[PDB]
Amino acid sequence: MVDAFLGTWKLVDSKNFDDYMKSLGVGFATRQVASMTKPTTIIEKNGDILTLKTHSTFKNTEISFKLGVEFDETTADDRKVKSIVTLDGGKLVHLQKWDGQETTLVRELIDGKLILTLTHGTAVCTRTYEKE
Ligand SMILES: O=S(=O)(O)c1cccc2cccc(Nc3ccccc3)c12
């Protein structure tokens, strides 16, 4: 259920984020900033339009979209992508494509926590957020 995602979530743990960002082109200077940072993800719905915002001292982004309906997105790291977000049995699956490249962001609730798995080819990163 989408509804179970809604609310504000605060990053508490991060695993292999640096390699994920490097895998995407994020430069060293910026990786150092982003990694010590502890972002908030806010997930909202308004009818059948979801909005996911990322709030932090590094960057601030927001996306709004319908599930299964493809959309343009400019990412935190300034990639210009084609995105699609679907719901695969409680798992929010965010697929991005740009320049023949693909990355996936999977969001699932485990133990009252929101676990985001980021995958870019072989670079995999897991980021755990606590409900606020
Ligand atoms: O986290 S995400 O927006 O998912 C994100 C996803 C994919 C690539 C990212 C690259 C740099 C920073 C991010 N965000 C970020 C925002 C605030 C603090 C630290 C990193 C990236």
Residue numbers in the entry: 0 to 131
What does the paper say about this structure?
Heart-type fatty-acid-binding protein (FABP3), which is a cytosolic protein abundantly found in cardiomyocytes, plays a role in trafficking fatty acids throughout cellular compartments by reversibly binding intracellular fatty acids with relatively high affinity. Each FABP has its own sequence, shows 22–73% similarity in amino acid sequence, and exhibits distinct ligand preferences, although all of the FABPs share a common structure consisting of ten antiparallel β-strands that are capped by a pair of α-helices. The fluorescent probe 1-anilinonaphthalene-8-sulfonate (ANS) is extensively utilized for examining the interaction of ligands with fatty-acid-binding proteins.
The crystal contains four identical hFABP3 molecules in an asymmetric unit. The same densities have been found within all four molecules in the asymmetric unit, indicating that the bound ANS molecules adopted an identical conformation. An important feature is that ANS is located in the middle part of the binding cavity lined with a cluster of hydrophobic side-chains. In addition to van der Waals interactions, these indirect interactions should contribute to ANS recognition. Indeed, the sulfonate group of ANS is positioned far away from Arg126 (6.4 Å) and Tyr128 (6.5 Å) so that their direct interaction is highly unlikely in the hFABP3–ANS complex. The structural comparison of hFABP3 and mFABP4 suggested that one of the causes is the effect of steric hindrance between the side-chain of Leu115 and the aniline ring of ANS, arising from the replacement of Val115 of mFABP4 by Leu115 of hFABP3.
